Symmetry: C3
Subunit: 112 residues, 3 copies
Amino acid sequence: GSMKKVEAIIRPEKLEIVKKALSDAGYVGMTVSEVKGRGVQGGIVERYYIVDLIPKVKIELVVKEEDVDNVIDIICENARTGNPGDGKIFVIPVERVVRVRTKEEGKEALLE
Amino acid sequence: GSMKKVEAIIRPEKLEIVKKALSDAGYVGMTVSEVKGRGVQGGIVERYRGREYIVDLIPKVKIELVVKEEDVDNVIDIICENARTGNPGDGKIFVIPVERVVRVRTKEEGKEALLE
Amino acid sequence: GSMKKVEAIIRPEKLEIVKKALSDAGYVGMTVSEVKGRGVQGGIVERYRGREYIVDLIPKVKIELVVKEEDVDNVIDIICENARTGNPGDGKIFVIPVERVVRVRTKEEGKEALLEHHH
Ligand SMILES: Nc1ncnc2c1ncn2[C@@H]1O[C@H](COP(=O)(O)OP(=O)(O)OP(=O)(O)O)[C@@H](O)[C@H]1O
Ligand SMILES: Nc1ncnc2c1ncn2[C@@H]1O[C@H](COP(=O)(O)OP(=O)(O)OP(=O)(O)O)[C@@H](O)[C@H]1O
Ligand SMILES: Nc1ncnc2c1ncn2[C@@H]1O[C@H](COP(=O)(O)OP(=O)(O)OP(=O)(O)O)[C@@H](O)[C@H]1O
Ligand SMILES: O=C(O)CCC(=O)C(=O)O
Ligand SMILES: [Cl-]
Ligand SMILES: [Cl-]
Ligand SMILES: [Cl-]
Ligand SMILES: [Cl-]
Ligand SMILES: [Mg+2]
Ligand code: NA
């Protein structure tokens, strides 16, 4: 079946708990990027300079389509705080997956 | 589909004006990354902070904005107008489909997820 | 007609080799990002106060090349040939659809925005 990239932008302080909850559920493979974001959360002020772009973490996990709902649930449960700035998750289609070492493709390419 | 990811690679010195332009036009949510790149070969050699980069990767900034598909033309026009200089290396923009958008806090999806 | 983004996550020490190989084959346009990756191995172990702890994220490099669909296989082949080592952690390549490409300087779109200039 099809594969999807789940791209989540979360608070950096939530990375370890989200990563662990994903791993616990069997989603071990992931790529993490340091980014900056702005949104309705607003910038860090001083006083009374603004820092409009604040540190965030991007997690990217390519998974089978059937697993997207569960990945989303895990990220939301573990990344949320109830305050503005908790982030967003984007699901992007992935048409092909290749393992560099072996040139395996498809579901094989995400399996040991 | 309804939503799209605009991935714009621009000059680092254009981040502030492009971000301001976008915010002033009502686009506040964006994610910004530091990257390096090259464009196509040939033509005038790219210069960065005074030096010619004949072969090395050149510092750029990536801005990712997920927006409704109806807003893509506007976003692209705002970025290009405010990012361009007329010299090679001004940038490139890719539009990528986004099938789903979810707000972490509420689990709201779709167009609500990008709003308010 | 269509465009694709080839996104490869490779070992940092293979970036220069992969970049050169791609450029030698005419694929010069690319965007490179430092990232951290978690792989299905390992590894890696640290001890503190009588306890082994594992460190799961390690540095990687992301390369993104937007190309015509007809070139995707060639790009994949070049990356695999030049990024591989035979050990766990050599990386993954993902191909993602791109619906529009725009060159900022000129507003040129599509194939035109990926086309070489005169040497
Ligand atoms: N439309 C978007 N496109 C790209 N990135 C976005 C977008 N919206 C939000 N982001 C990223 O997500 C981060 C959090 O966004 P925001 O501050 O708007 O809070 P939210 O959690 O998205 O919504 P709320 O604050 O209402 O819970 C931003 O800093 C940015 O990195
Ligand atoms: N095909 C591509 N794939 C991925 N990234 C690209 C591609 N082309 C350009 N980029 C990214 O966009 C940045 C800017 O490219 P650049 O402005 O040099 O494009 P160009 O097509 O050569 O146009 P110009 O003639 O205006 O320089 C690059 O440094 C790189 O980060
Ligand atoms: N499902 C995934 N989604 C996103 N990124 C991934 C995924 N799986 C792996 N990666 C990225 O690719 C890198 C390589 O992963 P991993 O070591 O699991 O695969 P491998 O390189 O194929 O190893 P092996 O060849 O031994 O299976 C990781 O560090 C991570 O950056
Ligand atoms: O890398 C630099 O500092 C200058 C660019 C350069 O040496 C080159 O690619 O020609
Ligand atoms: Cl991206
Ligand atoms: Cl020009
Ligand atoms: Cl993407
Ligand atoms: Cl092998
Ligand atoms: Mg160029
Ligand atoms: Na280089």
